[PDB]
Amino acid sequence: GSSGSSGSLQTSDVVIHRKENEGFGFVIISSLNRPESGSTITVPHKIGRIIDGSPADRCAKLKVGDRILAVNGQSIINMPHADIVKLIKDAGLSVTLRIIPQEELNSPSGPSSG
């Protein structure tokens, strides 16, 4: 009886908690809201910056690189950034980032320091 599954896309649930006096200390980058005819390996949304000393950083899960998929179960695909901004704010102090994890990463390297 094998461990494993059928090999389908996978997901994770990063909850992050704060107080009303303080931020959610994460930032989303990319967008590329330009319909590409072919499948490139591109994401509209991933983590770009995290505030040093945030509840994001101390979640000890969510780091810069993390491809996002939904926000409190809402598919952030066609949503305007205004909706997505308002969805996080509507979550108040506790927010759920549905992200896509991976197992297929290994050292990318390049002539850079990201």
Per the listing, tokens 């303080």 go with 22
The structure was resolved experimentally with: NMR
Number of structural domains in the chain: 1
Q: Distance (Å, rounded) from C-alpha 25 to C-alpha 35?
A: 30
User: Measuring CA to CA, which residue among 108, 95, 114, 113 is closest to residue 49?
Assistant: 114
Q: Distance (Å, rounded) from C-alpha 45 to C-alpha 28?
A: 6
What CATH number does the domain containing 25 carry? 2.30.42.10
User: Measuring CA to CA, which residue among 47, 49, 41, 45 is closest to residue 30?
Assistant: 45
Give the domain range for residue 105.
Answer: 1-114
For 101, how many CA atoms within 13 A lie in the half-sphere containing its CB? 9
